[PDB]
Amino acid sequence: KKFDFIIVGAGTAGPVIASRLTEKEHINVLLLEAGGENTNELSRIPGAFFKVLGTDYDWTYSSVEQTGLNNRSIYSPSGKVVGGSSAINVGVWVRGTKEDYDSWEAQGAKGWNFSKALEMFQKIEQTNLGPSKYHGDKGKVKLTDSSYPTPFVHTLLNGFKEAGFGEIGDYAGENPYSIDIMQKIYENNTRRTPADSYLTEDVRARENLTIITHAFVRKVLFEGTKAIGVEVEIDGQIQNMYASKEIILSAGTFNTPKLLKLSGVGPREELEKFGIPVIANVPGVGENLNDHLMFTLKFVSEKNIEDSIFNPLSDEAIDQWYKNKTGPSSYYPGVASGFVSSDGTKTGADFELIFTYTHGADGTEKEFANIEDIQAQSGYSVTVILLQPKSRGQLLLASTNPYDAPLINPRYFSDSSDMERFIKGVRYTQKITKTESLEPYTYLAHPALDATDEIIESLIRNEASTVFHPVGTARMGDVENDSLAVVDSSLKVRGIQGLRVADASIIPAVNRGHTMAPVVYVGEMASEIIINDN
Numbered sequence: 001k002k003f004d005f006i007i008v009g010a011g012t013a014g015p016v017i018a019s020r021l022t023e024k025e026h027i028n029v030l031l032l033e034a035g036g037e038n039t040n041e042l043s044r045i046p047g048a049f050f051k052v053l054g055t056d057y058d059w060t061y062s063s064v065e066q067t068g069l070n071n072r073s074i075y076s077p078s079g080k081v082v083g084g085s086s087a088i089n090v091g092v093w094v095r096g097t098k099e100d101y102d103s104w105e106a107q108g109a110k111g112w113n114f115s116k117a118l119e120m121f122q123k124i125e126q127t128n129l130g131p132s133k134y135h136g137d138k139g140k141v142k143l144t145d146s147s148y149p150t151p152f153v154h155t156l157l158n159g160f161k162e163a164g165f166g167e168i169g170d171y172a173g174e175n176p177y178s179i180d181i182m183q184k185i186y187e188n189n190t191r192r193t194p195a196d197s198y199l200t201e202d203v204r205a206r207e208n209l210t211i212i213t214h215a216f217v218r219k220v221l222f223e224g225t226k227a228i229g230v231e232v233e234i235d236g237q238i239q240n241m242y243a244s245k246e247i248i249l250s251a252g253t254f255n256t257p258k259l260l261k262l263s264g265v266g267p268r269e270e271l272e273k274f275g276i277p278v279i280a281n282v283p284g285v286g287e288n289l290n291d292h293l294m295f296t297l298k299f300v301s302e303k304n305i306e307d308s309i310f311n312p313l314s315d316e317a318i319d320q321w322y323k324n325k326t327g328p329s330s331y332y333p334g335v336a337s338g339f340v341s342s343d344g345t346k347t348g349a350d351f352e353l354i355f356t357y358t359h360g361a362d363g364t365e366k367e368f369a370n371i372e373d374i375q376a377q378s379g380y381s382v383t384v385i386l387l388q389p390k391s392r393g394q395l396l397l398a399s400t401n402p403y404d405a406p407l408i409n410p411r412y413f414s415d416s417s418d419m420e421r422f423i424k425g426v427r428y429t430q431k432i433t434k435t436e437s438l439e440p441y442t443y444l445a446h447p448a449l450d451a452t453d454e455i456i457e458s459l460i461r462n463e464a465s466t467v468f469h470p471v472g473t474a475r476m477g478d479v480e481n482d483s484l485a486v487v488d489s490s491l492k493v494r495g496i497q498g499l500r501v502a503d504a505s506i507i508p509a510v511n512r513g514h515t516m517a518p519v520v521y522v523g524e525m526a527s528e529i530i531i532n533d534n
């Protein structure tokens with residue numbers, strides 16, 4: 001078979017592009033994926049999916065020790081399956097704000113703005129929040145409200161409003177400073193990924209689309225500065241596969257920059273250190289790594305929270321789910337999210353608050369030391385996320401061995417403003433415990449409501465963790481005027497012909513939200529851009 005395009009990675013973005021490009025009969029596309037098809041049904045259960053973390057569905061990377069996080073190494077999973085990380089995530093669709101999408105253009109990516117995003121979300125989203133200017137009703141990706149067992153969700157929503165944080169309603173709509181029930185990529189309590197949605201039976205039956213799983217790409221092949229193919233391992237043997245038009249990397253934030261560097265596209269000094277011939281000196285490759293951190297405030301209640309205590313991992317729950325897609329396994333505790341402006345300026349949300357109707361305590365919290373049967377007690381939690389960290393890190397090669405994990409270093413809290421703002425965000429959030437709604441349910445707190453800045457800082461450095469939103473290691477921008485931009489507005493890699501990147505790696509900075517939705521946007525955008533070239 002003769003291919004026009006090879007797409008590396010059938011994750012979140014890659015599948016979109018394979019689906020769109022093969023709408024033209026004459027365009028042959030090869031889609032390569034290191035993992036298998038998404039056949040482990042446990043991964044599709046909203047309340048139990050996380051049991052597949054650490055398995056063959058996961059690359060199981062961790063960060064280098066983080067000096068800003070008390071030298072902790074941060075477990076940094078990513079999907080290894082058709083669906084990529086969208087196959088192993090909570091599945092919340094929290095796309096961000098106007099300023100997020102507009103900022104890409106402002107930093108040199110002409111044509112990438114909120115107006116285009118809205119146009120793409122009409123094609124992407126299938127939600128009962130639509131039809132509207134903000135939401136599609138008939139797009140490819142079905143979105144449903146999180147399922148929950150407890151009426152206490154209403155008390156959380158009311159508490160946010162009572163605290164003065166903002167309104168109850170659609171944070172992805174007209175008023176961003178709102179709290180809502182999060183929608184998720186589930187249909188009938190079963191995960192349906194973008195890949196499921198774009199690579200349907202019909203699409204896969206197209207003669208001009210070839211999908212190979214268990215295909216591990218080791219490097220991109222060149223003739224001069226022109227990308228012509230990939231070296232790929234299929235079932236313990238190596239093949240070279242070729243494209244007559246272009247190679248598209250959709251291997252995600254961690255593996256895309258690794259592949260680029262191994263292939264001779266990256267910072268000259270690092271490549272030369274490893275003896276890798278430099279085909280294009282692109283300093284930006286592997287730079288600008290950024291990610292969100294979350295810190296959870298936990299609250300134990302004396303007052304019962306009805307039907308809040310259940311076990312989504314029990315054999316009875318899981319069976320009930322297999323049988324008729326109901327029961328405890330339907331429920332993920334993180335159900336609502338609100339966006340706030342902690343300094344009142346409303347110039348873009350600065351914090352996200354994610355709410356559960358359980359304390360989420362492990363029992364080793366000092367403030368809960370003397371509580372009996374903590375797990376049987378009622379409570380709630382608010383996870384605070386600093387939405388626009390200034391810290392930037394690196395994705396480096398460990399070696400020239402294609403199988404070796406890349407070295408992931410977000411440099412969390414390396415920019416001093418991050419901790420400064422985070423401490424303020426925690427204190428802002430803690431006001432919610434004073435509301436008429438939530439004061440009745442706030443008996444003990446972690447951190448304590450009277451904790452010093454020093455105690456809060458220490459707890460953040462020891463307990464804050466990735467929200468799984470790495471971006472930025474092949475940043476899209478103005479490659480004429482910005483030495484650290486990697487790809488242009490057309491997603492073409494600088495210094496190279498016939499090579500594009502389309503995945504989270506091109507996203508300049510994390511959004512006010514979660515990264516699955518902007519990644520699907522990138523896939524729809526890449527598709528339109530490529531089709532309009534040809």
Ligand SMILES: Cc1cc2nc3c(=O)[nH]c(=O)nc-3n(C[C@H](O)[C@H](O)[C@H](O)COP(=O)(O)OP(=O)(O)OC[C@H]3O[C@@H](n4cnc5c(N)ncnc54)[C@H](O)[C@@H]3O)c2cc1C
Binds near residue numbers: 009093253
């Ligand atoms: C545990 C977890 C929870 C998350 N929760 C949410 C959430 O609820 N909502 C949200 O919006 N975001 C969430 N995210 C983030 C979001 O899922 C990702 O940002 C997004 O899916 C990344 O899309 P992508 O296409 O860039 O990469 P991926 O989805 O990681 O796709 C990359 C693909 O390339 C394949 N691949 C990589 N290297 C090679 C190679 N060399 N050869 C062949 N194939 C290769 C991978 O196997 C994979 O399928 C979560 C992430 C994780 C890990």
